[PDB]
Design an enzyme around this catalytic site. Structure first.
Site, PDB file in Angstrom:
ATOM      1  N   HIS A   1       0.764  -1.317  -0.006  1.00 44.50           N
ATOM      2  CA  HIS A   1       0.011  -0.051  -0.084  1.00 44.50           C
ATOM      3  C   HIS A   1       0.815   1.370  -0.128  1.00 44.50           C
ATOM      4  O   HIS A   1       0.348   2.222  -0.259  1.00 44.50           O
ATOM      5  CB  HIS A   1      -1.078  -0.160   0.835  1.00 44.50           C
ATOM      6  CG  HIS A   1      -0.555   0.572   2.475  1.00 44.50           C
ATOM      7  ND1 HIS A   1      -0.441  -0.462   3.456  1.00 44.50           N
ATOM      8  CD2 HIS A   1      -0.404   1.759   2.756  1.00 44.50           C
ATOM      9  CE1 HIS A   1       0.259   0.397   4.542  1.00 44.50           C
ATOM     10  NE2 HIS A   1      -0.042   1.449   4.109  1.00 44.50           N
TER      11      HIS A   1
ATOM     12  N   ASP B   1      -0.857  -7.218   1.598  1.00 41.22           N
ATOM     13  CA  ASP B   1      -0.027  -6.233   1.764  1.00 41.22           C
ATOM     14  C   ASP B   1       1.375  -6.127   2.299  1.00 41.22           C
ATOM     15  O   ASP B   1       1.874  -5.912   3.232  1.00 41.22           O
ATOM     16  CB  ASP B   1      -0.763  -5.121   2.988  1.00 41.22           C
ATOM     17  CG  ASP B   1      -0.275  -3.556   2.806  1.00 41.22           C
ATOM     18  OD1 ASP B   1      -0.024  -3.321   1.809  1.00 41.22           O
ATOM     19  OD2 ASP B   1      -0.557  -3.179   3.915  1.00 41.22           O
TER      20      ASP B   1
ATOM     21  N   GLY C   1       2.509   6.344   9.322  1.00 45.71           N
ATOM     22  CA  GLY C   1       3.688   6.844   8.943  1.00 45.71           C
ATOM     23  C   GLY C   1       4.831   5.527   9.262  1.00 45.71           C
ATOM     24  O   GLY C   1       5.941   5.716   8.717  1.00 45.71           O
TER      25      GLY C   1
ATOM     26  N   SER D   1       3.699   2.450   8.522  1.00 45.56           N
ATOM     27  CA  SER D   1       3.594   1.444   7.405  1.00 45.56           C
ATOM     28  C   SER D   1       4.691   0.762   6.776  1.00 45.56           C
ATOM     29  O   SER D   1       5.649   1.699   6.327  1.00 45.56           O
ATOM     30  CB  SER D   1       2.559   2.136   6.210  1.00 45.56           C
ATOM     31  OG  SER D   1       1.204   2.267   6.573  1.00 45.56           O
ATOM     32  N   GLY D   2       4.816  -0.317   6.479  1.00 43.99           N
ATOM     33  CA  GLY D   2       5.950  -1.294   5.861  1.00 43.99           C
ATOM     34  C   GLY D   2       6.980  -1.553   6.802  1.00 43.99           C
ATOM     35  O   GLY D   2       7.808  -2.475   6.368  1.00 43.99           O
TER      36      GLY D   2
HETATM   37  C1  82J Z   1      -3.339  -1.359   4.065  1.00 44.33           C
HETATM   38  C2  82J Z   1      -4.016  -0.228   3.666  1.00 44.33           C
HETATM   39  C3  82J Z   1      -4.537   0.784   4.370  1.00 44.33           C
HETATM   40  C4  82J Z   1      -3.622   1.533   5.259  1.00 44.33           C
HETATM   41  C5  82J Z   1      -4.054   2.326   6.288  1.00 44.33           C
HETATM   42  C6  82J Z   1      -5.195   2.669   6.588  1.00 44.33           C
HETATM   43  C7  82J Z   1      -6.277   1.732   6.040  1.00 44.33           C
HETATM   44  C8  82J Z   1      -5.810   0.881   5.088  1.00 44.33           C
HETATM   45  C9  82J Z   1      -6.844   0.072   4.098  1.00 44.33           C
HETATM   46  C10 82J Z   1      -7.585   1.183   3.057  1.00 44.33           C
HETATM   47  O1  82J Z   1      -6.705   1.054   2.078  1.00 44.33           O
HETATM   48  C11 82J Z   1      -5.876   2.381   2.257  1.00 44.33           C
HETATM   49  O2  82J Z   1      -6.244   3.213   3.075  1.00 44.33           O
HETATM   50  N1  82J Z   1      -4.791   2.322   1.370  1.00 44.33           N
HETATM   51  C12 82J Z   1      -3.620   3.439   1.621  1.00 44.33           C
HETATM   52  C13 82J Z   1      -2.704   3.483   0.476  1.00 44.33           C
HETATM   53  C14 82J Z   1      -1.782   4.295   0.596  1.00 44.33           C
HETATM   54  C15 82J Z   1      -1.729   5.101   1.560  1.00 44.33           C
HETATM   55  S1  82J Z   1      -0.213   6.365   1.637  1.00 44.33           S
HETATM   56  O3  82J Z   1      -0.404   7.527   2.691  1.00 44.33           O
HETATM   57  O4  82J Z   1      -0.218   6.815   0.251  1.00 44.33           O
HETATM   58  C16 82J Z   1       1.087   5.159   2.271  1.00 44.33           C
HETATM   59  C17 82J Z   1       2.544   6.120   1.625  1.00 44.33           C
HETATM   60  C18 82J Z   1       1.489   4.873   3.588  1.00 44.33           C
HETATM   61  C19 82J Z   1      -2.507   5.229   2.897  1.00 44.33           C
HETATM   62  C20 82J Z   1      -3.635   4.016   2.623  1.00 44.33           C
HETATM   63  C21 82J Z   1      -2.363   5.833   4.027  1.00 44.33           C
HETATM   64  N2  82J Z   1      -2.913   5.391   5.419  1.00 44.33           N
HETATM   65  C22 82J Z   1      -4.077   5.957   5.822  1.00 44.33           C
HETATM   66  C23 82J Z   1      -2.273   4.389   5.938  1.00 44.33           C
HETATM   67  O5  82J Z   1      -1.262   3.895   5.302  1.00 44.33           O
HETATM   68  C24 82J Z   1      -2.952   3.347   6.831  1.00 44.33           C
HETATM   69  N3  82J Z   1      -1.815   2.787   7.718  1.00 44.33           N
HETATM   70  C25 82J Z   1      -1.839   2.113   8.866  1.00 44.33           C
HETATM   71  C26 82J Z   1      -0.701   1.166   9.440  1.00 44.33           C
HETATM   72  C27 82J Z   1      -0.876   0.848  10.749  1.00 44.33           C
HETATM   73  C28 82J Z   1      -1.573   1.238  11.564  1.00 44.33           C
HETATM   74  C29 82J Z   1      -2.835   2.225  11.046  1.00 44.33           C
HETATM   75  C30 82J Z   1      -3.982   2.506  12.042  1.00 44.33           C
HETATM   76  N4  82J Z   1      -3.813   2.136  13.232  1.00 44.33           N
HETATM   77  O6  82J Z   1      -4.831   3.196  11.662  1.00 44.33           O
HETATM   78  C31 82J Z   1      -2.847   2.490   9.824  1.00 44.33           C
END
Ligand code: 82J
Ligand code: CA
Lengths: 55, 251
Positions: free
Chosen positions: B41, B90, B187, B189-190
């Site tokens: 993602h 993911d 932030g 993520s990954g």
């Molecule tokens: C699996 C994907 C996901 C990822 C998350 C939320 C929902 C979803 C499912 C729905 O799909 C998307 O929203 N995709 C998506 C795609 C790109 C970006 S981005 O910003 O382009 C990238 C560079 C990180 C983001 C989301 C930003 N963003 C919100 C997140 O990265 C967020 N990550 C995250 C990680 C750990 C804990 C928590 C927590 N406790 O909430 C949240």
């Protein structure tokens, strides 16, 4: 054997024909004569923290 | 990371910082000298594929201390089963343009074998999660690398212990707290979810998603890395392909 307490292995466990068990190590490690322990064969083995290892 | 502490310099030597045009993008885990595992993602909104940088030996974002190593990301490999904007599958496998040099500050994390990861690592209760993500929900991101110890949950307990909710698949796992005090955030993520077993650390999870940063009644969701060992190993033995982004069949 491997399913219970990792077959006694420090790292990887393979089950064989019968109640035979071979422990294995990740690259950068070698198996000791006890057949369970792994010792590093390189300066920077994976999953080890040098600053903590040098303490 | 919410409710953690500063990871002392050199104590998370496999932590990767991913940059796009010099801006913070994601975390990653170094698994050998040329390969990094991150989340699929992270690359959903990338257009400038040639501007992707991986930083190893990073600790403090405000200073260059000489331990940092930067490399261009030559290739981003994602499973065919991953759908942009969704949660499942993911994971991303990154090939660095040139190997990193292993030092006291740059060390890979062990990518374990599947059996060992499923029958032994899945049962270690606590694991470390890290990144330079947000310190609070709707707050600023960290300047120094943060680390948090989180407990892993059985998928049944994750469902009953939690308060338009996405499902938790066999390719995911929950880890963390429900009281809103401690969590991995977007932030982060990954980044790695690292498990200690008999003196060695292993890659068991990837910081993937959640229902808001450190939200009450909700846990962190991590990619279940054990499901990808064979897919990862086969790709690391394959010849590079022209183009940065590669979609690879899964399984
Ligand atoms: C699996 C994907 C996901 C990822 C998350 C939320 C929902 C979803 C499912 C729905 O799909 C998307 O929203 N995709 C998506 C795609 C790109 C970006 S981005 O910003 O382009 C990238 C560079 C990180 C983001 C989301 C930003 N963003 C919100 C997140 O990265 C967020 N990550 C995250 C990680 C750990 C804990 C928590 C927590 N406790 O909430 C949240
Ligand atoms: Ca720095």
């Amino acid at each position: 054997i491997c399913v219970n307490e990792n077959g006694g292995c420090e790292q990887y466990c393979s089950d064989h024909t019968g109640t035979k068990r071979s422990c294995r190590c990740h690259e950068g490690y070698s198996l000791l004569a006890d057949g369970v322990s792994c010792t590093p064969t390189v300066e920077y083995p994976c999953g080890k923290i040098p600053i903590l290892e040098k303490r | 990371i919410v409710g953690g502490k500063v990871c002392p310099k050199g104590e998370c030597p496999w932590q990767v910082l991913l940059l796009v045009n010099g801006a913070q993008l994601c975390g990653g885990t170094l698994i050998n000298t040329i390969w990094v595992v991150s989340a699929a993602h992270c690359f959903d909104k990338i257009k400038n594929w040639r501007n992707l940088i991986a930083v190893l030996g990073e600790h403090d974002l405000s200073e260059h201390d000489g331990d940092e190593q930067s490399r261009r990301v030559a290739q981003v490999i994602i499973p065919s089963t991953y759908v942009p904007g969704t949660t499942n599958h993911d994971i991303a496998l990154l090939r660095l343009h040139q190997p990193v040099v292993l030092t006291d500050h740059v060390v890979p994390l062990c990518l374990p074998e599947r059996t060992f990861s499923e029958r032994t690592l899945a049962f270690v209760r606590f694991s470390l999660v890290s990144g330079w993500g947000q310190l609070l929900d709707r707050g600023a991101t960290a300047l120094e690398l943060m680390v948090l110890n989180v407990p892993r949950l059985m998928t049944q307990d994750c469902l009953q212990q939690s308060r338009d909710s996405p499902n938790i698949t066999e390719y995911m796992f929950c880890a963390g707290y429900s009281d809103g005090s401690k969590d991995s955030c977007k932030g982060d993520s990954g980044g790695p979810h690292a498990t200690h077993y008999r003196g060695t650390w292993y890659l068991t999870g990837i910081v993937s998603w959640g229902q808001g940063c450190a939200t009450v009644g909700h846990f962190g969701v991590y990619t279940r890395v054990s499901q990808y060992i064979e897919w990862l190993q086969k790709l690391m033995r394959s010849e590079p392909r022209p183009g940065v982004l590669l979609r690879a069949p899964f399984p």
